[PDB]
């Protein structure tokens, strides 16, 4: 009688797009706000006036 | 059997840093605010209308 969508299967293709995929990534706040010191070991001692 | 941080003892040296040590020193307010005079002797007389 006629050709439905099911009767032509994969001769109609379904497409892909990635317009919604690219989520942006956010850094640490405290690395942006405060000064860093590089440590070379587990402990550093910092004298402060008291 | 395995090696712990405590089992390594003082092969791991603790570090030091002076980052937090420095503090800015503050001068007298009155030496900023008022006109000063260089004295050459203990006592100076300044007459005023009374």
Rounded CA separation B21/A38 (Å): 17
How far is it, in rounded angstroms, from Cα B17 to Cα A41?
Answer: 12
Is A25 in a helix, a strand, or coil?
A: coil
Question: B23 and A47: CB-CB below 8 Å?
Answer: no
Would you call A17 an interface residue with chain B, using a CB distance cutoff of 8 Å?
A: no
Residue bearing tokens 């000064």: A35
What is d(CA A42, CA B6) in angstroms, rounded to the nearest whole number?
12
Instruction: Report which DSSP code applies to A12.
Output: B
Min Cα–Cα distance to chain A from B18, Å = 6
Resolved by: cryo-EM
- Distance, in Å, from the CA atom of B41 to the CA atom of B31, rounded to the nearest integer, reads 19
């Amino acid at each position: 009688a006629d050709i439905s969508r099911s009767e032509v299967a994969t001769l109609i293709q379904e497409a892909y797009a990635n317009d919604l995929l690219a989520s942006a990534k956010k850094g640490s706040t405290v690395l942006q706000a405060f000064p860093t010191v590089n440590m070379g070991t587990k402990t550093t001692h910092l004298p402060v006036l008291a």
